[PDB]
From a paper:
The CARMA1 signalosome, which is composed of CARMA1 (caspase recruitment domain (CARD)-containing MAGUK protein 1), BCL10 (B-cell lymphoma 10) and MALT1 (mucosa-associated lymphoid tissue lymphoma translocation protein 1), is a macromolecular complex responsible for lymphocyte activation. CARMA1 forms intracellular multi-molecular complexes with BCL10 and MALT1 that are known as CARMA1 signalosomes during lymphocytes activation and proliferation, creating a primary signaling complex for the activation of NF-κB. For assembly of the CARMA1 signalosome, CARMA1 interacts directly with BCL10 via a CARD:CARD interaction and BCL10 interacts with MALT1 via an interaction between the C-terminal Ser/Thr-rich region of BCL10 and the first Ig domain of MALT1.
In this study, we report the dimeric structure of CARMA1 CARD at a resolution of 3.2 Å. Although CARMA1 CARD has a canonical six helical-bundles structural fold similar to other CARD domains, our structure shows the first homo-dimeric structure of CARD formed by a disulfide bond and reveals a possible biologically important homo-dimeric interface and novel homo-dimerization mechanism. The high resolution structure of CARMA1 CARD showed that it forms the canonical six-helical bundle fold comprising six helices, H1 to H6, which is characteristic of the DD superfamily. There was one dimer in the asymmetric unit, referred to as chain A and chain B. A flexible loop formed by residue 64 to residue 70 was missing from our model. The electron density of that region was too weak to trace, indicating that the loop is extraordinarily flexible relative to those of other CARD domains. Interestingly, an unexpected disulfide-bond formed by C28 from each molecule was detected. CARMA1 CARD exists as dimerand further oligomer mixture in solution and was all changed to the monomeric form by the addition of DTT and by mutating C28 to Alanine, indicating that CARMA1 CARD forms a stable dimer in solution and that the dimerization is mediated by a disulfide bond.
Residue numbers in the entry:
A (entry chain B), B (entry chain A): 22 to 63, 71 to 108
Write the structure that this text describes.
């Protein structure tokens, strides 16, 4: 069920601003400060998803919560 | 319907040499040499796909052929 986000790899990267998300992910200890700069200052969105696919269910749950909040319409697009 | 390619996007990237596909692709007349060395003279293959997206359905069709040809196992997963 990570294959939700993965189908939508293309368009998300196209619409989402990663910078808005990563804070809440930093907070929820899904990612650390190294991954936030690594995303932000290593298109950079694809990087974020890349690293999130490494994080299992805990990752997905949180990302989706952030995706819902800042990107509600896109999120519907992803979720069924 | 880019979906078969674009759901397997993460795993297609990790297992393709764009160098094997480009000359085929150019010659098919779907991409041009600017495209070829834009991609090549560089998920350095994410770009290849992204570019093909830009061509729509002919892009899709012809990308699928090159898998039928050069990564026949990848072709398999992609077509089911």
């Amino acid at each position: 069920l990570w294959d939700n986000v993965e189908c939508n790899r293309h368009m998300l990267s196209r619409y989402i601003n990663p910078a808005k998300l990563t804070p809440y992910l930093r907070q929820c200890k899904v990612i650390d400060e190294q991954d936030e700069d690594e995303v932000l200052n290593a298109n950079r969105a694809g990087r974020l998803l890349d690293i999130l696919h490494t994080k299992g269910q805990r990752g997905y749950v949180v990302f989706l919560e952030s995706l819902e909040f800042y990107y509600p319409e896109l999120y519907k697009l992803v979720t069924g």
